Design an enzyme around this catalytic site. Structure first.
Site, PDB file in Angstrom:
ATOM      1  N   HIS A 216      13.845  49.653  88.401  1.00  0.00           N
ATOM      2  CA  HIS A 216      14.716  49.412  87.244  1.00  0.00           C
ATOM      3  C   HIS A 216      15.414  48.138  87.599  1.00  0.00           C
ATOM      4  O   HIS A 216      15.645  47.901  88.788  1.00  0.00           O
ATOM      5  CB  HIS A 216      15.845  50.457  87.098  1.00  0.00           C
ATOM      6  CG  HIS A 216      15.424  51.746  86.455  1.00  0.00           C
ATOM      7  ND1 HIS A 216      14.942  51.809  85.172  1.00  0.00           N
ATOM      8  CD2 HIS A 216      15.327  53.006  86.957  1.00  0.00           C
ATOM      9  CE1 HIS A 216      14.544  53.045  84.906  1.00  0.00           C
ATOM     10  NE2 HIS A 216      14.772  53.783  85.980  1.00  0.00           N
TER      11      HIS A 216
ATOM     12  N   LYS B 232      15.670  44.494  71.317  1.00  0.00           N
ATOM     13  CA  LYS B 232      16.964  44.806  71.889  1.00  0.00           C
ATOM     14  C   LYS B 232      17.764  43.518  72.099  1.00  0.00           C
ATOM     15  O   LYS B 232      17.229  42.399  72.052  1.00  0.00           O
ATOM     16  CB  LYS B 232      16.800  45.546  73.226  1.00  0.00           C
ATOM     17  CG  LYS B 232      16.279  44.641  74.246  1.00  0.00           C
ATOM     18  CD  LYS B 232      15.281  45.312  75.096  1.00  0.00           C
ATOM     19  CE  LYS B 232      15.952  46.271  76.018  1.00  0.00           C
ATOM     20  NZ  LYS B 232      15.765  45.497  77.293  1.00  0.00           N
ATOM     21  N   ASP B 233      19.030  43.669  72.438  1.00  0.00           N
ATOM     22  CA  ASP B 233      19.903  42.472  72.576  1.00  0.00           C
ATOM     23  C   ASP B 233      19.550  41.549  73.740  1.00  0.00           C
ATOM     24  O   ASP B 233      19.829  40.354  73.667  1.00  0.00           O
ATOM     25  CB  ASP B 233      21.380  42.822  72.807  1.00  0.00           C
ATOM     26  CG  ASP B 233      22.048  43.525  71.627  1.00  0.00           C
ATOM     27  OD1 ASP B 233      21.430  43.736  70.572  1.00  0.00           O
ATOM     28  OD2 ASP B 233      23.244  43.915  71.788  1.00  0.00           O
ATOM     29  N   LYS B 234      19.013  42.076  74.806  1.00  0.00           N
ATOM     30  CA  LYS B 234      18.788  41.204  75.886  1.00  0.00           C
ATOM     31  C   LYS B 234      17.798  41.736  76.835  1.00  0.00           C
ATOM     32  O   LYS B 234      17.577  42.933  76.948  1.00  0.00           O
ATOM     33  CB  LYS B 234      20.111  41.027  76.628  1.00  0.00           C
ATOM     34  CG  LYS B 234      20.104  40.110  77.792  1.00  0.00           C
ATOM     35  CD  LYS B 234      21.427  40.281  78.565  1.00  0.00           C
ATOM     36  CE  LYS B 234      21.575  39.377  79.791  1.00  0.00           C
ATOM     37  NZ  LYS B 234      22.155  38.055  79.407  1.00  0.00           N
ATOM     38  N   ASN B 235      17.165  40.803  77.514  1.00  0.00           N
ATOM     39  CA  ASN B 235      16.248  41.142  78.613  1.00  0.00           C
ATOM     40  C   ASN B 235      16.125  39.982  79.610  1.00  0.00           C
ATOM     41  O   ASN B 235      16.058  38.839  79.230  1.00  0.00           O
ATOM     42  CB  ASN B 235      14.851  41.526  78.116  1.00  0.00           C
ATOM     43  CG  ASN B 235      14.065  42.192  79.219  1.00  0.00           C
ATOM     44  OD1 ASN B 235      14.445  43.247  79.668  1.00  0.00           O
ATOM     45  ND2 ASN B 235      13.023  41.567  79.687  1.00  0.00           N
ATOM     46  N   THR B 236      16.082  40.288  80.891  1.00  0.00           N
ATOM     47  CA  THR B 236      15.993  39.262  81.909  1.00  0.00           C
ATOM     48  C   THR B 236      14.586  39.349  82.467  1.00  0.00           C
ATOM     49  O   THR B 236      14.151  40.451  82.850  1.00  0.00           O
ATOM     50  CB  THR B 236      17.009  39.581  83.060  1.00  0.00           C
ATOM     51  OG1 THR B 236      18.325  39.367  82.569  1.00  0.00           O
ATOM     52  CG2 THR B 236      16.805  38.660  84.272  1.00  0.00           C
TER      53      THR B 236
ATOM     54  N   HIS C 230       9.856  42.913  83.366  1.00  0.00           N
ATOM     55  CA  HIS C 230      10.732  41.931  84.006  1.00  0.00           C
ATOM     56  C   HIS C 230      10.061  40.864  84.792  1.00  0.00           C
ATOM     57  O   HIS C 230      10.785  40.031  85.347  1.00  0.00           O
ATOM     58  CB  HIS C 230      11.745  42.684  84.930  1.00  0.00           C
ATOM     59  CG  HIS C 230      12.643  43.632  84.200  1.00  0.00           C
ATOM     60  ND1 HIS C 230      13.653  43.202  83.365  1.00  0.00           N
ATOM     61  CD2 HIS C 230      12.657  44.984  84.105  1.00  0.00           C
ATOM     62  CE1 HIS C 230      14.244  44.233  82.785  1.00  0.00           C
ATOM     63  NE2 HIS C 230      13.650  45.346  83.210  1.00  0.00           N
TER      64      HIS C 230
END
Length: 102
Positions: free
Chosen positions: A97, A31-35, A10
């Site tokens: 997390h 995967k669909d998304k990550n910030t 992150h």
């Protein structure tokens, strides 16, 4: 799970994350998304100062965010940049997390 992994997943030293490259690596596995948070590590770590047992905390300051959001084509993304507050799970004084934005 721990501060070192949270950094890998992150924290970014460039706002212009090359999503189609990085998200296809095994760490992210399409995967669909990550910030990603565009910031040096100390201001992100400071969010959790003094917090020992796991606890979710909402940042008091805003941060530069770069999201890789998947498109209609699998493992192909659009980079969206914004500035917002976010929440992390703090444990033993470090973010471990990412929870969510805003």
């Amino acid at each position: 799970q721990d501060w070192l992994t949270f950094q890998k997943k992150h924290i970014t030293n460039t706002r212009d994350v090359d999503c189609d490259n990085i998200m296809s690596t095994n760490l992210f596995h399409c995967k669909d998304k990550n910030t990603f948070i565009y910031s040096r590590p100390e201001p992100v770590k400071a969010i959790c100062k003094g917090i020992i047992a796991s606890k979710n905390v909402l940042t008091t300051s805003e941060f530069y965010l770069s999201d890789c959001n998947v498109t209609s084509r699998p493992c192909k993304y659009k980079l969206k940049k914004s500035t917002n507050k976010f929440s992390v799970t703090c444990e033993n004084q470090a973010p471990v997390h990412f929870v969510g934005v805003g």
